[PDB]
């Protein structure tokens, strides 16, 4: 890919493939020019070290990169653990994060959610109403009504969030109680409020700890966030029958 400004940003494989096709291309020549067997016998010995620097580089002299001083990154150093797999053991859309605060007026099953965030996660839903209620003729004309923050969307956004459970989850998620759904309530500010009883499940002090929030999109995914994962179902920790919502 060409970077911005003229430089290119090549992967570290176009440095290794050029080194096999070059050496293999020469060894095609020495068998037509008929060199002695001190050289061509040194060619195959030199090619075979370049095919094996491609598969798994490092079990040899560690053919470090040119024009730089770190070792190249071969194919078998791409699946090899980064502590985990290359596939799914998945960064995720419809997310956010902010500084949690207290908000001790909430019920047990609801968490705050700032207007400036909820208007950004629930965007494709809001586009549905503004073209369903006829307020916007076409979708391009709805993208310019949400950018202005017209006073109509603040009343359409509230009906999109009628019973739509969101998923708060803290960073080092130890046990299954580290992820719980909540029914949002639109506040003003930029801190995700959170009922004080539940802050001992996440193990969250209120001194700067942030918390991602997700959004279950489909129709089976906001029932699993209400039957199984809701915050009023988990009052007994799974490790043992003792409660987990003790007033702290």
């Amino acid at each position: 890919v060409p970077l911005d400004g003229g430089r290119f940003a090549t992967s570290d494989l176009n440095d290794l493939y050029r080194r096999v096709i070059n050496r293999n291309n020469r060894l095609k020549r020495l068998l037509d020019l008929a060199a002695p067997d001190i050289i061509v016998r040194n060619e195959k010995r030199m090619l075979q070290e370049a095919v094996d620097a491609l598969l798994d580089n490092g079990r040899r002299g560690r053919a470090i990169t040119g024009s730089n001083k770190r070792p190249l990154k071969s194919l078998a150093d791409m699946i090899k653990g980064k502590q985990g797999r290359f596939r799914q053991n998945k960064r995720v859309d419809y997310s956010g994060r902010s500084v949690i605060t207290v908000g001790p007026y909430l019920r047990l099953h609801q968490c705050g959610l700032p207007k400036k965030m909820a208007l950004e996660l629930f965007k494709p839903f809001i586009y549905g109403k503004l073209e369903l209620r006829g307020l916007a003729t076409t979708i391009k004309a709805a993208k310019k009504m949400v950018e202005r923050e017209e006073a109509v969307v603040w009343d359409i956004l509230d009906e999109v969030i009628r019973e739509h459970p969101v998923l708060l989850n803290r960073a080092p998620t130890l046990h299954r109680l580290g992820i719980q759904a909540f029914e949002p309530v639109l506040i003003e500010g930029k801190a995700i409020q959170l009922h004080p009883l539940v802050c001992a499940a996440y193990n969250a002090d209120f001194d700067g700890d942030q918390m991602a929030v997700h959004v279950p999109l489909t129709l089976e995914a906001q029932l699993e966030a209400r039957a199984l994962m809701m915050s009023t179902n988990n009052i007994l920790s799974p490790a043992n029958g003792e409660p987990i919502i003790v007033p702290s």
Partner: peptide
């Protein structure tokens, strides 16, 4: 005499 040498440049000169 092959003292576990690996890199060819050792093997070329030798």
């Amino acid at each position: 005499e092959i003292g576990r040498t690996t890199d060819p440049v050792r093997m070329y000169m030798r």
